[PDB]
Design a binder for this molecule. Structure first.
Ligand SMILES: Nc1ncnc2c1ncn2[C@@H]1O[C@H](COP(=O)(O)OP(=O)(O)OP(=O)(O)O)[C@@H](O)[C@H]1O
Ligand SMILES: Nc1ncnc2c1ncn2[C@@H]1O[C@H](COP(=O)(O)OP(=O)(O)OP(=O)(O)O)[C@@H](O)[C@H]1O
Ligand SMILES: Cn1c(=O)c2c(ncn2C)n(C)c1=O
Ligand SMILES: [Ca+2]
Ligand SMILES: [Zn+2]
Ligand SMILES: [Zn+2]
Lengths: 497, 48, 146, 48
């Protein structure tokens, strides 16, 4: 559902098809992971464990929410007294002694399930975010020569931090294609330095011991303890510099360091009441509507600061006799004896209220600059209260219309067209329900994917004849065999209907 | 001739005017490097 | 039926029928239909409030409690922050209410020592509940007619 | 109105030509053709 949504209302319309193939090639990886989750001691135990806490991933999440909506409520009984049981934050329970302790046992739990959320994410979702990136390096070298012909961007960050992985002899760890290093050597090859690309893509002894793996296959030596040196430390630094950039493993970090800290003031456990608005499918929508128009919100709060600066300069150069702070005589606390003192009357008691610096600055009935005060107040009232606090309504009240539109193009362009060809609902309605047929037995997303898993499973010598063609064209990447404009009914529409 | 035909890709322009015989006809011609070079500068692009 | 028989006991319970009008008048149903249609998005946004003013309550109780007051009579009676749950019911009856913010009901802070911690605490409150949340509750109504 | 007026362009310069006036349709009887009709046939620039 999510993939279909974000390919019709962004920049597709030509290259959408390669995205669909890219969609297939990582659901391929996702289904393999799910199958795998459904000293000998160490081994067995490690596995069974990491695999209960990677299927029970969503339950442990909601439980954290319930446990914090609890502990937060047990805090609304704190009280303060100058005489103890300096001021003492003792607990004013509902007479019964059963609250001072339970708050001591629902804190330690809130810091165990928090540990599983981290361990759990590190095995359910991390393998995929590596696959989606290890795939790009191979494709941007085989067909573009990113690190052979040119320089990546000379400015980007995720285009040169990955220069640290090509040299290690373990580059293809997840992307299936454990040869993404020999068949680039042959395409560029002669035109570039054959003897120098033999080492800049790691893989030493290539120019000498190329066909060395010709005799036979040896056996690896088992062992333990000493195996802790076979760590390609350089590759680990690279992946451990990628996961710390993902927006997910840093909203999981700030859960852990709020709870451990809470063990120091027990009030920091308040920040979780603030995850609600990050779950409840509905709440995300509302907040999404607020954040979507968000530069237009920050810069319009900006334009304010400056409008009240021009009102401050006019007040300071003329009207400062009208400001006051006391009835006690001798004129104390005149709020305009300095600039910057004056600019912080115009925001705390300025843009606030609902009438204007007009209600906090004496009255001006006794002539001498009178009709310069009424004109100064009325133009202020319209130009900040009525307009600028109506724009901050408009940028919100409009955003719901745009987000509910964008969610009514899909549901009306995935019900009036195909998604492989591009024909209409019309043509295919010359007979009893045909559009409901064209996308249940003819074209039909699914069917096209399960092909890409038939070809892989079957042996090579037996591919029929209309498969060896669509498997010598997924390898090279020349997607032309998709119909994209023609249909079996359309071509043979007289030879027999 | 996949060298000549590839090297002279960004140098020939194809036009589809209609005239004389009341029929569609194609036109081919040549454009210099400087002629195209003074087209992708940001000032002209925003004017487009 | 059970409002009328009951009315035979206090004759004021007969008020509930003035409330069927909005269930007839073909027009009135339309308006009210527009309100009720976006109705989970309304209940959960009143929700999101309760929690925002909880974060402002925890920050008030842990720092600013000397600025709250209730009398000129000396000996400091009625300090409205001496308990949580008492403090959380100043922030709704005299809190989200009015049109300026707990800023107009909590002494003034001109005499230094945590001053620019009060002005930053009030301005961010004014925008984050009055200007935004009471505009979202309006946007969910104006859009429903569309 | 203003974000409307800015969503007629981006939907009428992606569903029509600008020299002729034909649709995105007709030109989609083959592999990508509308992306061709405005890269080698009609194509603003070339005419200038
Ligand atoms: N090949 C296709 N071309 C066009 N539309 C398709 C194709 N395959 C599926 N669909 C769309 O998906 C719908 C039928 O599948 P399905 O009912 O699974 O969609 P869904 O309701 O989004 O998913 P689900 O029913 O699993 O919630 C139809 O509305 C159809 O337009
Ligand atoms: N002759 C033409 N007829 C119709 N549309 C054209 C024509 N020439 C260009 N276009 C439009 O411009 C787009 C392709 O050119 P280009 O990508 O330069 O447009 P742009 O994105 O507005 O400009 P730029 O890419 O320089 O920012 C297409 O969307 C296409 O519809
Ligand atoms: C050999 N092969 C695979 O093994 C493969 C794949 N996509 C996923 N896998 C696993 N493709 C496209 C592929 O060519
Ligand atoms: Ca065979
Ligand atoms: Zn089809
Ligand atoms: Zn054209």
């Amino acid at each position: 559902r999510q993939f279909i949504f974000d390919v019709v209302n962004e920049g597709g319309e030509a290259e959408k098809m390669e995205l669909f193939v890219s969609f297939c090639e990582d659901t391929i990886f996702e289904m393999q992971i799910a199958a795998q989750i459904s000293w000998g001691e160490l081994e067995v135990q490690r596995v069974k464990f990491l695999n209960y806490l990677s299927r029970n991933f969503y339950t442990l999440k909601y439980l954290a929410l319930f446990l914090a909506f609890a502990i937060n409520f047990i805090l609304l009984f704190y009280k303060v007294s100058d005489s103890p049981p300096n001021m003492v934050y003792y607990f004013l329970e509902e007479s019964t002694g059963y609250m001072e302790p339970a708050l001591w046992c629902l804190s330690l739990l809130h810091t165990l399930v928090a540990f599983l959320m981290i361990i759990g994410y590190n095995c359910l979702k991390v393998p995929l975010v590596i696959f989606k990136r290890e795939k790009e390096l191979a494709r941007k070298l085989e067909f573009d020569g990113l690190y052979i012909t040119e320089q990546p961007g000379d400015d980007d960050v995720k285009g040169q931090w990955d220069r640290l992985v090509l040299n290690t002899p373990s580059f293809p760890s997840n992307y299936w294609d454990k040869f993404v290093k020999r068949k680039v050597l042959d395409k560029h090859g002669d035109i570039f330095g054959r003897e120098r690309i033999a080492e800049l893509l790691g893989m030493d002894l290539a120019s000498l011991e190329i066909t060395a793996h010709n005799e036979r296959k040896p056996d690896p030596p088992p062992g333990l303890l000493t195996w802790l040196m076979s760590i390609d430390v350089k590759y680990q630094i690279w992946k451990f510099g990628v996961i710390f950039t993902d927006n997910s493993f840093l909203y999981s970090g700030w859960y852990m360091v709020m709870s451990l800290l809470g063990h120091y003031n027990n009030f920091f456990f308040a920040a979780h009441l603030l995850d609600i608005a990050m779950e409840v499918k509905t709440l995300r929508t509302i907040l999404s509507s607020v954040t979507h128009n968000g530069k237009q919100l920050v810069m319009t709060v900006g334009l304010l600061a400056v409008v009240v600066y021009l009102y401050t300069v006019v007040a300071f150069n003329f009207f400062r006799k009208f400001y006051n702070k006391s009835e006690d005589e001798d004129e104390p606390d005149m709020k305009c004896d300095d600039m910057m003192t004056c600019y912080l009357f115009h925001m705390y008691v300025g843009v606030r209220a609902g009438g204007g610096i007009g209600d906090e600055i004496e009255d001006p009935a006794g002539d001498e600059y009178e009709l310069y005060r009424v004109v100064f107040d009325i133009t202020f009232f319209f130009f900040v209260i009525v307009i600028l606090l109506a724009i901050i309504q408009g940028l919100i009240i409009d955003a719901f219309g745009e987000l509910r539109d964008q969610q009514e193009q899909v549901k009306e362009d995935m019900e009036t067209k195909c998604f492989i060809c591009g024909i209409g609902s019309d043509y295919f309605d010359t007979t009893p329900h045909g559009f409901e047929t064209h996308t249940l037995e003819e074209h039909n997303l699914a069917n096209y994917m399960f092909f890409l898993m038939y070809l892989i499973n079957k042996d090579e010598t037996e591919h029929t004849g209309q498969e060896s063609y669509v498997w010598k064209m997924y390898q090279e990447r020349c997607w032309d065999f998709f119909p994209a404009g023609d249909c079996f009914r359309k071509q043979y529409e007289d030879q027999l209907s | 001739a996949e060298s000549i035909l590839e090297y002279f890709r960004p140098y020939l322009g194809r036009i589809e005017i209609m005239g004389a015989s009341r029929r569609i006809e194609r036109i081919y011609f040549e454009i210099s490097e400087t002629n195209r070079a003074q087209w992708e500068m940001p000032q002209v692009k925003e004017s487009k």
